[PDB]
Design a protein around this ligand. Structure first.
Ligand SMILES: C=C1C(=O)O[C@H]2C[C@@H](C)[C@@H]3[C@@H](OC(C)=O)C[C@H](O)[C@@]3(C)[C@@H](OC(C)=O)[C@H]12
Length: 130
């Protein structure tokens, strides 16, 4: 019985999924994000990728017999630049922010139950303490 693992596979595959997001290929969800006075922004993505990084997106998208193709979802209580970074995190495993924003990001991550960014931003904030 021959067996093989490519330990770099998930990383390569995500690199391509993020390219597909950036060229807007295969996308099946458009996140329309309106936050108070921010201009509206919209982000296209793949449901299965969002679902695999956030229990909130997974529950959002897993509903028996559902839409065919492009669902537009309205997103309210989060700033576009925060949603942007959570999407990136989901597609890349990485997130960056101006130390001013660590808190708004932690807020976004809590709402989408992105566990690992929640720790990340809590440890930062706490480290930032005397
Ligand atoms: C870095 C950005 C981010 O990731 O989310 C933005 C949050 C948004 C509410 C922010 C607003 O904050 C105030 C004081 O109204 C004004 C501010 O211009 C803002 C749009 C961005 O800048 C910072 C440092 O907070 C934030």
């Amino acid at each position: 019985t021959f067996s093989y693992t490519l330990e770099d596979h998930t990383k390569q595959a995500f690199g391509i999924m993020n390219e597909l997001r950036l060229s807007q290929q295969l996308c099946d969800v458009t996140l329309q994000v309106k936050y108070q006075d921010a201009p509206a922004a919209q982000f296209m993505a793949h449901k299965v990728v969002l679902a695999s990084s956030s229990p909130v997106f997974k529950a959002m998208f897993t509903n028996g017999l559902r839409e065919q193709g492009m669902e537009v979802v309205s997103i309210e209580g989060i700033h576009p630049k925060v949603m942007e970074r959570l999407i990136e995190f989901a597609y890349t495993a990485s997130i960056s922010m101006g130390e001013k924003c660590v808190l708004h990001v932690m807020n976004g991550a809590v709402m989408y139950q992105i566990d690992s960014v929640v720790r990340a931003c809590a440890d930062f904030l706490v480290q930032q303490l005397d």
